Amino acid sequence: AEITASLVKELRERTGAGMMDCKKALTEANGDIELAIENMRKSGAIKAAKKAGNVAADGVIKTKIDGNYGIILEVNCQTDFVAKDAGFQAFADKVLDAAVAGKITDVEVLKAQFEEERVALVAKIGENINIRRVAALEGDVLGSYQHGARIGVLVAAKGADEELVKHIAMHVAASKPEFIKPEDVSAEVVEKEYQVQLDIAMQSGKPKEIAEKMVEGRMKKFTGEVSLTGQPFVMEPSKTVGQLLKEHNAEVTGFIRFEVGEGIEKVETDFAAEVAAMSKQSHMSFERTKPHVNVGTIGHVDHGKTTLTAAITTVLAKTYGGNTSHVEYDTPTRHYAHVDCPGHADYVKNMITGAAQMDGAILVVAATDGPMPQTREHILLGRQVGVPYIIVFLNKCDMVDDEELLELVEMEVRELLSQYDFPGDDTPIVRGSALKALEGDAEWEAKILELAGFLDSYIPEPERAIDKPFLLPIEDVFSISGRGTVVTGRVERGIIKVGEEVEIVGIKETQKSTCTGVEMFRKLLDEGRAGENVGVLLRGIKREEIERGQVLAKPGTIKPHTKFESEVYILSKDEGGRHTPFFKGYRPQFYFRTTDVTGTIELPEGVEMVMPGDNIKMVVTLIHPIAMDDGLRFAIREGGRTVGAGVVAKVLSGASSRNSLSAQLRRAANTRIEVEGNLALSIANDLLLAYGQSPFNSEAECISFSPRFDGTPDDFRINYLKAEIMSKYDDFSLGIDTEAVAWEKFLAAEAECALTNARLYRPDYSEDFNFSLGESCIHMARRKIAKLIGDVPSVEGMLRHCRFSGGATTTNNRSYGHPSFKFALPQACTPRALKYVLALRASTHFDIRISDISPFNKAVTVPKNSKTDRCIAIEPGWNMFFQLGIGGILRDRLRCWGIDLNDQTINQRRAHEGSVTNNLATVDLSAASDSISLALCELLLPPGWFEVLMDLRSPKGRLPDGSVVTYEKISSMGNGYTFELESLIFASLARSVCEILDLDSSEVTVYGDDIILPSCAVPALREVFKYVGFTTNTKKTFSEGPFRESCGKHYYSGVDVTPFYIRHRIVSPADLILVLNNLYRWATIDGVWDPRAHSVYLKYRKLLPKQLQRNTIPDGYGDGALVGSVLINPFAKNRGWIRYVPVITDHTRDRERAELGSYLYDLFSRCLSESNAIDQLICRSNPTKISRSTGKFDIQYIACSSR
RNA sequence: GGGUCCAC
RNA sequence: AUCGUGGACCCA
Ligand SMILES: Nc1nc2c(ncn2[C@@H]2O[C@H](COP(=O)(O)OP(=O)(O)OP(=O)(O)O)C[C@H]2O)c(=O)[nH]1
Ligand SMILES: [Ca+2]
Ligand SMILES: [Ca+2]
């Protein structure tokens, strides 16, 4: 102890100084009141001194307007909480007011006019806070916008009234225009920018005026975009601010916008790792049902909430046992996850988003100082975010002489806690020291344990989902004869035993029923527990009386509501959200558990605009009811895109478009564009002419032209286009061409597998004597394959990959290709595959039927080139079901060889690399999979795998002839594993060739038959390939050009030269629009036209119905309209702050689905799930609906966004 | 899972 | 009448 404790208190609640700083400073003043104050004053500067070391990236912006003189203020601090603290507020307010009356604009004048009072706060608050920048603006009429505290703007305008400047001050706030007019721009920044960009493209080989006209064009936009004038007005994006101004014959003499912490470095912080940094210097020196508890640490930055979390972690594993950046520690009875709450807006975001709710927090104040002023905001955060419980850890107590002075701090904190309706008198306050606890000081060491004790007994145990009342969100409803109505979904809370009664509540007038049963795909069941996907059978309720969106619940347990208040986070542009602000009548979709519902909102008192990234409270009223109570999370959507997240906070009491304009566009769409001859050919020739190349002078030329693999990238680009553009056109007349050539090819491959099948089952040449590269690779590949693949396909593996999907089987036509029809209609199967079906039949109570048991698949023909089709075979359904099982296991395994058959994007980039580097080759095989013979396959794969492949393939094929083939190849295109299998065979060979040549196997990459491996390996790979029956496509393999190509991307010395194809006769406006869009994407850099192609574009644009020539959409939205500028689009309809544009759609009619088949398909899928910053988890997977395509077009409005 | 696009 | 796989956009 030292001096009277009652005296320090008098000093503190007079000065706002830390406890110990009041003590030691009162000890040297010999107990002199008005004296101690000064010793601290003169010190307040040395304090701020060491303070001004810390980065202060947070703060506020303030704004003041006197008649027609205004000023913008940027005083900032280092924390959210300080930013909204009364004291910091009052400083910033005064430092502003004082800068108004005294029209100051010199940062350093007031920066010093207050330097005195600035140490005043910095002492008290204990964060570096400095005036950053000031500026002032005068104009004839001016107006300010304040976007919370984070952005302020001053706008000076001549000719405009109150509303005008308000509105364009808001726009400046949203759209960061760095200049008032496109010409204002630094004729320098733009000068060298046009000299830099004039090569980037002139290096393509683009002729002078071509790259000149293009660069010019960009910078016309480039400047228009960063300029208030040429910006789409934020409250009216169809017209620009420029045009808006000119409509009120007014103008902006200038503007200012400051944003808190702009340009400040703003250091990243990693809490998790960060702790392990402190638990390092010290660490060196089955209860699996235990509940998980989320706790939060919150307090003053250097009061050491960090050091504590460290002390907690060490001591808690040193003694007892052993989302997103969260340390976690274990207690004999509970498991804790622990996050730091560094900022107020950050936490509110994570609470809404769900990426971190919290069961209890721990407030960390140092007894050295005591509550800070911003300590109230810490607690206030807790109150506003609804933390149920707050524990206090009093830290740094070893540095408190008088324990009567701890009695004092603990008092202030209870007093605050209670001021915010927390149970102050009753909240645990452990008095300890994190630091001495890391230094294994058994005393202070047990105080941590103590605090932990409170976490166990003070924060109550979170209700297990199973302990809650029953609720299942209905995903789909089926009517099954002789079973009744049944709903499927995942049970969210509780248990439902057959017998029990249930309400079905949500969209309609709530209804009641009883549980007739509970089933999964494998077994029937008598109850469904939380977390289980199930069907639930219901008694007496028709299936047109249930609806996705409704919930199934224990009766009275949940109610339907329409109006409620919430806290939402609006996604930033960054995070895939809106890029434009919205306003009063925002009208999006609210996605609850399993469905969207339209709803209007009302903003809070005084907020008029919302920006991507904003938290906000809003009151939401829905177009019809949804079952809900407090805590229900939801997503905000714009036609499929997720733009925000929210949680219901308190449920309340509840209570455009175009007709003969869509009709106009629909008529246009079903119009038939009509011309003379081959419109495609005409377009291709007009293109070639515009690039000064000879046209095709006949149909027969369009498919027989070879490029020159030299010349500049630009020359080559149009050459390759010319070689490819018409190469797959399906409507040439000139030609007795047929699918005859396809079947010839199909027979040639079989004949080749017949050779290699004989050769490879007889390689006793005479004697060992001679050794060969091929023989060796097969041996090398075999062994490596076995290592990757197993002796046999796991039963788990197959159980998580088998499934139906897609199109026609031997028993179903395209119409009945949906999985639900494969389950509802008996599928054919192969003699050797029958046991698989039976094993399936034995594992489920559902009927598993086979229609016929033959060894045939159906070989048909399918389009490919202008000069040949491609022979496919349609499999028996049950065989397909299992072929996909092995195809899915091979897919996974290949991931261990760096092969990823989900991402063609990795092959495209190595093709680009290869064309610049010449170290990687791209190779193609001729009849890639058709050439993989039985023999090769039998030598490479484990016998276990080979037998299974043999059970699962179709051994025979019946052709359109009626003729048969007994397959020489291991499998045909159309099989459910041929693709993954061919990928494996090719990879293993190429990898083996690498090892034999002393290259790295990892350099080998394969997507089906798109092979990429080091250029030096090619001659040896060619040799191996020849040996094993393959024939490499010398025309499509490149190991030495400037040219590469893989998975649809073509490169010439790094430049993208992938072409586009006119595949069909152009007959409808949709046909023409695709072609023109394909031209657009081919000839367009960043929305800017190569002029050579533009001319051809505008010519054929004219062949479209007129409305359709102006109906434009942004790229990335398909081809139901011309890709162009959407702001120009006259048919655009902005509705509720979301932009709807109409696109052409293929028009469909509904068809009846198969009820049992769909139900089976549903349960089967849920069975699959179970066998195998993130909030997108707020969505599902959709009901089976069947539809037939009529041959007409429809018009669909869709949600759109400038970019 | 459909329609479309682009690919293996 | 149009097999298997992947990716994107719209639907759903
Ligand atoms: N089931 C199926 N597989 C395909 C299809 N297209 C390509 N593939 C698969 O990927 C491999 C690549 O085929 P392609 O390179 O286009 O043709 P190819 O059979 O090897 O013949 P070629 O190069 O001589 O034209 C072969 C085949 O397994 C297809 O349309 N259906
Ligand atoms: Ca090929
Ligand atoms: Ca290829």
Short mmCIF file of C-alpha atoms in Angstrom, two decimals, chain A residues 54 123 246 265 323 347 379 466 550 565 643 722 796 857 948 1129 1131:
data_model
loop_
_atom_site.label_atom_id
_atom_site.label_comp_id
_atom_site.label_asym_id
_atom_site.label_seq_id
_atom_site.Cartn_x
_atom_site.Cartn_y
_atom_site.Cartn_z
CA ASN A 54 1.02 3.36 -32.91
CA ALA A 123 -3.58 10.53 -21.74
CA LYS A 246 -27.50 20.06 -67.53
CA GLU A 265 -1.09 1.78 -44.29
CA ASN A 323 -14.79 -19.78 -36.98
CA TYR A 347 -18.09 -7.77 -34.69
CA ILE A 379 -19.93 -2.90 -22.94
CA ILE A 466 -31.70 -32.20 -30.31
CA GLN A 550 -43.07 -24.10 -45.13
CA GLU A 565 -37.00 -5.80 -37.68
CA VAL A 643 -26.10 -9.43 -51.75
CA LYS A 722 -10.08 -18.02 -90.75
CA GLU A 796 -16.98 -46.75 -49.55
CA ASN A 857 -25.11 -50.81 -75.71
CA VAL A 948 -14.59 -54.61 -62.04
CA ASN A 1129 -30.70 -0.12 -72.76
CA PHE A 1131 -35.93 -1.71 -72.15
#
